[PDB]
Amino acid sequence: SLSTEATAKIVSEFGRDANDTGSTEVQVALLTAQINHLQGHFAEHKKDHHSRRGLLRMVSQRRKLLDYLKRKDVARYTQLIERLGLRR
Amino acid sequence: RKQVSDGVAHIHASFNNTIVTITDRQGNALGWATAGGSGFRGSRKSTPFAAQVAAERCADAVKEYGIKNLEVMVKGPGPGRESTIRALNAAGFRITNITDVTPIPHNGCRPPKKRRV
Amino acid sequence: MRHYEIVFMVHPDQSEQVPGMIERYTAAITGAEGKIHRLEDWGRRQLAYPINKLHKAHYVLMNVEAPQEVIDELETTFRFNDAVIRSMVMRTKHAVTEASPMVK
Amino acid sequence: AVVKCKPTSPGRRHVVKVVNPELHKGKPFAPLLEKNSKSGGRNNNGRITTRHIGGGHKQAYRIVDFKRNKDGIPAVVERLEYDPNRSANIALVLYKDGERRYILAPKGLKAGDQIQSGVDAAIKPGNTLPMRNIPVGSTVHNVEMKPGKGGQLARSAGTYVQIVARDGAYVTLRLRSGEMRKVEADCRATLGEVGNAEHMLRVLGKAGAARWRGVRPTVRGTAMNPVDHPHGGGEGRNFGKHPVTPWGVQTKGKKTRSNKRTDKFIVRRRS
Amino acid sequence: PVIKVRENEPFDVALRRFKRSCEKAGVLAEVRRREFYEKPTTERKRAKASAVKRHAKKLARENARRTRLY
Amino acid sequence: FCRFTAEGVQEIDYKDIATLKNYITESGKIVPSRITGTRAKYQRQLARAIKRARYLSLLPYTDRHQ
RNA sequence: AAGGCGGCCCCCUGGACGAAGACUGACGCUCAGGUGCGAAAGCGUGGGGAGCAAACAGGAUUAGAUACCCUGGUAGUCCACGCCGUAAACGAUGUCGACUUGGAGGUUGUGCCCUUGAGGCGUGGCUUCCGGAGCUAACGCGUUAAGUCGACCGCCUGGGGA
Ligand SMILES: [Mg+2]
Ligand SMILES: [Mg+2]
Ligand SMILES: [Mg+2]
Ligand SMILES: [Mg+2]
Ligand SMILES: [Mg+2]
Ligand SMILES: [Mg+2]
Ligand SMILES: [Mg+2]
Ligand SMILES: [Mg+2]
Ligand SMILES: [Mg+2]
Ligand SMILES: [Mg+2]
Ligand SMILES: [Mg+2]
Ligand SMILES: [Mg+2]
Ligand SMILES: [Mg+2]
Ligand SMILES: [Mg+2]
Ligand SMILES: [Mg+2]
Ligand SMILES: [Mg+2]
Ligand SMILES: [Mg+2]
Ligand SMILES: [Mg+2]
Ligand SMILES: [Mg+2]
Ligand SMILES: [Mg+2]
Ligand SMILES: [Mg+2]
Ligand SMILES: [Mg+2]
Ligand SMILES: [Mg+2]
Ligand SMILES: [Mg+2]
């Protein structure tokens, strides 16, 4: 998983209160960090299908959280994908 | 004839035959006898009597080496598992040790398939 | 960093070179900014079964808080040295410091 | 990377290229080149001694360090190059004192790595040290047979030699053929397998790809006249005789080794 | 089962101790188990029937302890 | 009557040989949890420590090999 | 998740559960088509090959014995990368949620009482057996339902032919 300091660095980066830890941008960026960290793992370990299922779970969760943010407030969605470098 | 004092009785007790081999403590064999060589065949040689006469023959074959002390290694399951070391005491040998040295793998090679009988 | 418990088994005729190995390994760790928690020579000891056609060995215990890279280098040092016979590194949850039940 | 070609023409239908994008796309190092004049399989008498050789593309010779004598001095690997003279790729290395040389490229070697010969060298792929300094059970290549003569064993694209034993002055080797051979323990060897392991995965596709490599066509012996070959002749396809050479020597099975000088160095033959 | 005959010990005593230790360490049933290959289907089936035998016999022994026969 | 539950250790030490010798048989086999009444958590820790002491020749794999 | 996973050590890594809080605020469930995984056997290329073992060979058995039994034994089994995409792939029981008498265990947390011992009292997850109402053609299931309900999907329509 992601380390504690990287979690708190994201939480304090995108949290309005540095302790919300469950806001939509916080959960998205924590998923995007663990996904981009595991690109190197599955580039080396291509047969780790059991871990790859957890990766696809992270992707599907991020997409559901993004679609909620999109129809709840669009401008935060644009600011989020622009800051995280997400194609959608 | 070279005298030797201590010895080792290896007993290879299989289901079909029992092989008794007297050797030294170094593995240099001194004499041997089998149940099939003891005048028995087929159904008779998978018996404990066949083994206790294979042991009587083998002690007679190592009579001239002057053995008084003997330790026993026992290998395999069979009927001559015990009556052999009975006759090896009854020859007039002071027994010393009875070690069980059957080979037990730690899940190694695959055994053959089951007999559909 | 990463708490390791290292035990290695030295050829007993190289028992004299043991403190030179220990001092080099300790200077490898502290040179790599690692901590050393316990360090217990156990002496010559009778083996349970003959490794490498010989019956005794010289044991060394070491509890270490080092980064894993220099530990992998230390494993390669045990690997290519023929004086050391066996080496075992076991990752530990914390740093242990109390003496072993066989150092007593 | 092997690449199967698309069948835009017969002759490209079955071609498998071996594409290495790391090879230098330029000219080789000019001081280490010399002329390699072709022979045609013809000796100083002009007669053809070895058959089926002739033609092919012009090839410059690359001087390759097999003796590997620059001891103590570390060397960085400058670039990897193609050698037409051999199946393995070569590496242009630059020593610290300013000397450049060509070595055989090992498996995992790339541009920028450090190599080092000598006895006190480390054990990584590329180093060259005597096999009394090399641990038993390791894979080495470019192996000397005599000390200082130069490497002669395991030089082709994917080969390696295992070190199975050592008894004083000698080490016992497991050659790529499977033969167990004694070599003196002072002979140098180079760590790791040789590079281009997928060389044998190529398929030439057409006859011209062998004529590019200077391999003239082989006429099989039964398609001849009896004056030409022992197999020749027949009214139709007839072969009622045992397979021999063009010179009447049995081929399917008959051994031809007759060297009693080196029989003491052979532990077991190949099987 | 390396068994040393104690000083002034009869042979039938030491032999009965050797059969005792061989039955303790479980050698004969080990070789009979390893004489042929048993599939993991057959092994899972024999272990399930051994547990059901353990269990239905435990409940039958405790229920049959209660009621009489005459 | 688990001893490790009584004494309350967080992890069984493979270095405690006199304990592991109180939990292996004469032929080096691991004594089952039915006999000693060991809780199966400590039985797993004990087998994992015995296999390490076997690797370090602190305990035998069997009584015969030499 | 299923298939499946069994010496020990390290590296990378996924998931579950518990305890107090903090936070977001319905963001959820199901899913045609689609995509991915998917035992063994099998296929392809390159290795490897001890044991076992289809095929095959010999010996017996038999009326015959292209079998069971025996002595051998090749693909295969093993490794890497691909393909195949099937099994009595079974709990022969689709997923998610809610409610409805009990008992004896197993496993894994955790709270409290003086732990006055490994105890006493609870509270969560998973799991095995029996069994009540109820259900069911019956067998049986039975708080892990095959009971009472809700949402969505998949499927069935006499036996062959197939
Ligand atoms: Mg998570
Ligand atoms: Mg058989
Ligand atoms: Mg030719
Ligand atoms: Mg040809
Ligand atoms: Mg031809
Ligand atoms: Mg003609
Ligand atoms: Mg002629
Ligand atoms: Mg004709
Ligand atoms: Mg003819
Ligand atoms: Mg609120
Ligand atoms: Mg579908
Ligand atoms: Mg398979
Ligand atoms: Mg295959
Ligand atoms: Mg193959
Ligand atoms: Mg074979
Ligand atoms: Mg057969
Ligand atoms: Mg189906
Ligand atoms: Mg099932
Ligand atoms: Mg079904
Ligand atoms: Mg679903
Ligand atoms: Mg019931
Ligand atoms: Mg209903
Ligand atoms: Mg229901
Ligand atoms: Mg029904």
Coordinates of C-alpha atoms (C1' of nucleotides) in Angstrom, one line a residue, chain F residues 1-2 5-6 39-41 44 47-48 51-52 55 61, chain G residues 6-10 106-110 115 117-119:
Chain F
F1 CA -2.9 -26.0 29.6
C2 CA -0.9 -24.2 26.9
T5 CA -0.6 -19.0 27.0
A6 CA 0.5 -19.3 30.7
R39 CA -3.0 -23.5 21.2
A40 CA -2.7 -23.7 17.5
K41 CA -1.3 -20.2 17.1
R44 CA 2.3 -22.7 14.2
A47 CA 6.8 -25.4 14.0
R48 CA 8.1 -22.3 12.2
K51 CA 12.2 -25.6 11.0
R52 CA 14.6 -22.7 11.5
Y55 CA 18.2 -25.1 9.2
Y61 CA 15.8 -33.2 11.1
Chain G
rG6 C1' 1.8 -26.5 1.9
rG7 C1' 9.9 -26.7 3.8
rC8 C1' 12.6 -22.0 5.3
rC9 C1' 14.5 -16.9 4.2
rC10 C1' 14.4 -12.1 1.7
rG106 C1' -13.4 -24.7 16.0
rU107 C1' -10.6 -20.3 14.5
rU108 C1' -9.4 -15.2 14.8
rG109 C1' -9.4 -10.4 17.2
rU110 C1' -11.0 -7.1 21.4
rU115 C1' -5.8 -12.1 35.4
rG117 C1' -3.9 -19.1 37.6
rA118 C1' -4.0 -21.3 32.2
rG119 C1' -9.9 -18.0 35.1

